[PDB]
Design a protein around this ligand. Structure first.
Ligand SMILES: [Mg+2]
Ligand SMILES: [Mg+2]
Ligand SMILES: [Mg+2]
Ligand SMILES: [Mg+2]
Ligand SMILES: [Zn+2]
Lengths: 136, 58, 116, 76, 94
RNA sequence: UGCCUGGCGGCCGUAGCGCGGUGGUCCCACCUGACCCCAUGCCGAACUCAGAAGUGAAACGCCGUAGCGCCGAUGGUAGUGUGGGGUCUCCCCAUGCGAGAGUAGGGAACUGCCAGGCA
RNA sequence: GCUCAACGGAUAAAAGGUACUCCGGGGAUAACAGGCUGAUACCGCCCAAGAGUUCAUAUCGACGGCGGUGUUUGGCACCUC
RNA sequence: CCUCCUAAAGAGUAACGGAGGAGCACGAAGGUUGGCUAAUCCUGGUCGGACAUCAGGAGGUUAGUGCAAUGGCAUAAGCCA
RNA sequence: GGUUCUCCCCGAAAGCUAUUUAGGUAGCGCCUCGUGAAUUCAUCUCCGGGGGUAGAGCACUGUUUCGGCAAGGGGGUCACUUACCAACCCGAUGCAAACUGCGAAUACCGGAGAAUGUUAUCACGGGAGACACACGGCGGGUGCUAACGUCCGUCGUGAAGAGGGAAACAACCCAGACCGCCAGCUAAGGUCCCAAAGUCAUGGUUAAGUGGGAAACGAUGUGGGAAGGCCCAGAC
């Protein structure tokens, strides 16, 4: 599961998901998977979508993960009043903007890329699309 | 300077305190109050602030 | 480094006289010669300058730089300063100790009648 | 772990901005370290508080080879 | 070899730039050399088909604007974040 | 007035670093000697004294070089005041101001007083 | 000379029970219930490795995703002391 | 009571919001004068290794500052007499 | 809990600080009245400013992916190496309320200037009330980017404002009711009737009553735009 091994502080504020993305072009491989919608990707969603494609793109080529969560979300458990400080850390999320390249793949045919990225788009809570590396 | 005319179009109820102070500096009191002003950039900058709700006749 | 350690040593004494707006008397010491300049408080111009590389001073000297030469040029700057009348200059040791020719150039100018 | 304390916020910041004519002895900038440095007619306090030493206007300059900020007072 | 029809821009800033992108256009620029930079607007659908080939970024480009053929070269391209579109393309006179 | 060098500045990397070349009549630097004036938390390295045998090495000054640092547009993008609107977790439209990064490019500083040497 | 530490410090000097209770109030504040909300719960849908002798979708479904109902445990303290 | 963030580019700004720390120490660890420049790493090497101490080189404050943290500090507020 | 005649003018607050205080009270802010005061204050323009938030970036403080180079350590060795693990450094790429080598918009502070405003400003004095605020937009903390949830900043309205519109609906939109009239022009909002006004004109879309509640996702529904393959040696 993708999570930071060590942080300077345990907790973090809620924040917002405003602004545009900066991960625009594929710069590691030739094929990419770019996010269209807006939302957050939890630690389970990034791990499951990596497992979802890897089944069909068997052991050749190379897959990069362009994002990293670096943001915890705390929860208040059931039958607990409001207050009593901030709750305990449960799972890590990543702030994702429209235009962020999430998943990349190289060393595969283009027809194989269309299949695996379709199989990983259902596991993601936001809409995605297929992109291809353009030079310069 | 030369004379222009400023006529208020909308009301001053839901406005910001800066927009309420702008209409007091322009001498506008109600909808339809046509009054004469000078065309200096100090007055023109007051027009640019409330241009959504005033009518100007050059 | 040799020269840059001398500059950082004097730098506290340089900018302190800048904060007071007084006229400083800097010295440069050399195994050959010795220098002394009276500087305006802006720092970009001098008013009284006399050294031992000038032939007017070196004729009466056996060697160009010693404790006898610093007494000669210390008086020589001080005599040119009284002709101008800068009258309570400040003394800048400029990174050297106040033991040798720096002390000899200062005490010679104290004997002439300058207020420092 | 057992958090929930905060001190009284000390009233720092710039109290006299540039262009303002101040009196001799007035406090310009209250500060902890030397965020601003003393310059012309400006004294540095015990707690690094920069104050006025002459009647004039506040002038901010960035001098020195280390690109540090200064406060100077020019005569009005 | 590539010929691109262009027109000179009459306004500047992001105000005119967003009005061109809502009207199937996008702004660009031509700089380099001893000449002043010239504000250039370009048709969006024409450039989008041409840029799909690798020769659009390597070869020497020709632009016909105001009865003048200026030989340039593609230096940098700004793309839309999530849609497959273009934003701004840099041109160096070569 | 030119060239070269020292001192104190203005300025604070378009003033730096690296590389290559060069300067010794003067200048500065190292160097010579040191019982002594003094100095070392050991040490004449530094500090400082007394001298000039030697020398442009180290350092410094200048010239040349775009490897690096740095400076840096035009246009575009992100953001935002005011007003309006939408599919209202967000974004668009009208108008005003305009980034950051990156690119073209600039760039081996400039300048003031005074002193010395050469012509 | 005060850990007056409850630290702008009611006394030099102070722990409990009340279901035998009582008064003055309060929906400004709980318990029954409504209402708001939908984490949880219930139900449905999308992608399909795997189970189904072979064979994803006859019957099922991991890792994950999107809703509906207001239906459990709640959250809130908006109506009512 | 103190430090940072929440705090929305002045100040101010809450919550049983997020991370700590203090009820001192000090006659020098104060004042002043005169000096001094680390962290890390390379190479060399009687005892000597991972470190005892040095030399030069690289590096130029990432070191240090009686302590919590921030803002400072080379003219050093660091260090020594 | 209740407080009884009328008329006119002005008009709050639900904040801060402190409290055996938390539904109380005091000072201050805010309200009214009176005196006094500088051209005081507000708005815009220019000038003088300080920024480190939005964003952006990874030099620094932390984190993270890949590649190259690799001291060391393990193993093989009769001084070197191997299909081993791997720090630092270098290139590429992200993320951060408590990162900033960068950097706004406005806001804020000061100066000058015109216009406008019944001094709207400050000082002082007499008397208060209030210190339970609500929701909406925006910037957030918290909560599930749940709450007609809670806690702040800012603005608006309500509270303390009727009227018109959103069917009805304090907080939304328009607009602040001196009174009378069977006048007109308009705002938001509408024009086939209920119910006042186009069964209006032009160019399209939709055939589902969508409109007139609801997502991922699925489909030869249809309208619009650009780029290709094949074909009068006869294509589909
Ligand atoms: Mg706009
Ligand atoms: Mg020597
Ligand atoms: Mg040499
Ligand atoms: Mg820029
Ligand atoms: Zn089946």
């Amino acid at each position: 599961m993708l999570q930071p091994k060590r942080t300077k502080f345990r907790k973090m504020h809620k924040g917002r998901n405003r602004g545009l993305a900066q991960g625009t072009d594929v710069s590691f491989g030739s094929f990419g998977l770019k996010a269209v919608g807006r939302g957050r990707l939890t630690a389970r969603q990034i791990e499951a979508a990596r497992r979802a494609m890897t089944r069909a793109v068997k052991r050749q080529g190379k897959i990069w993960i362009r994002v990293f969560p670096d943001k915890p979300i705390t929860e208040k458990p059931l039958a607990v009043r409001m207050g009593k400080g901030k709750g305990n850390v449960e799972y890590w999320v990543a702030l994702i903007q429209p235009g962020k390249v999430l998943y990349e793949m190289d060393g595969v045919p283009e027809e194989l890329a269309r299949e695996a990225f379709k199989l990983a788009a259902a596991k993601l809570p936001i809409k995605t699309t297929f992109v291809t590396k353009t030079v310069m | 300077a030369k004379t222009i005319k400023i006529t208020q179009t909308r009301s001053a109820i839901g406005r910001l305190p800066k927009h309420k102070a702008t209409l007091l500096g322009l001498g506008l009191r109600r909808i339809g109050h046509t009054v004469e002003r000078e065309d200096t950039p100090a007055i023109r900058g007051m027009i640019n602030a409330v241009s959504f709700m005033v009518k100007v006749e050059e | 480094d040799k020269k840059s350690a001398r500059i950082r040593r004097a730098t506290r004494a340089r900018r302190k006289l800048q904060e007071l707006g007084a006229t400083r008397l800097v010295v440069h010491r050399t195994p050959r010669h010795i220098y002394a300049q009276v500087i305006a408080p802006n720092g970009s111009e001098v008013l009284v300058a006399a050294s031992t590389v000038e032939k007017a001073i070196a004729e009466q000297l056996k060697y160009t730089g010693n404790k006898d030469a610093a007494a000669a040029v210390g008086k020589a700057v001080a005599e040119r300063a009284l002709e101008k009348g800068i009258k309570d200059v400040s003394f800048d040791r400029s990174g050297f100790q106040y033991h040798g020719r720096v002390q000899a150039l200062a005490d010679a100018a104290r004997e002439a009648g300058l207020q420092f | 772990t057992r958090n929930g304390r905060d001190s009284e916020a000390k009233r720092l910041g710039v109290k006299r901005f540039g262009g303002e004519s101040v009196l001799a002895g007035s406090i310009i900038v209250r500060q902890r370290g030397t965020k601003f440095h003393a310059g012309a007619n400006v004294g540095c306090g015990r707690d690094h508080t920069l104050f006025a030493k002459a009647d004039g206007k506040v002038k901010f300059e960035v001098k020195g080879p280390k690109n540090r900020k200064f406060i100077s007072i020019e005569a009005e | 070899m590539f010929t691109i029809n262009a027109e000179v821009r009459k306004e500047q800033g992001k105000g005119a730039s967003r009005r061109l992108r809502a009207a199937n256009k996008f702004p660009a620029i031509i700089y380099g050399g001893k000449e002043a930079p010239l504000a250039i607007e370009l048709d969006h659908d024409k450039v989008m088909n041409m840029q799909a080939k690798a020769e659009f970024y390597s070869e020497v480009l020709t632009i016909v604007v105001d009865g003048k053929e200026i030989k340039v070269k593609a230096q940098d391209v700004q793309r839309h974040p999530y849609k497959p579109k273009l934003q701004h393309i840099d041109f160096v006179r070569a």
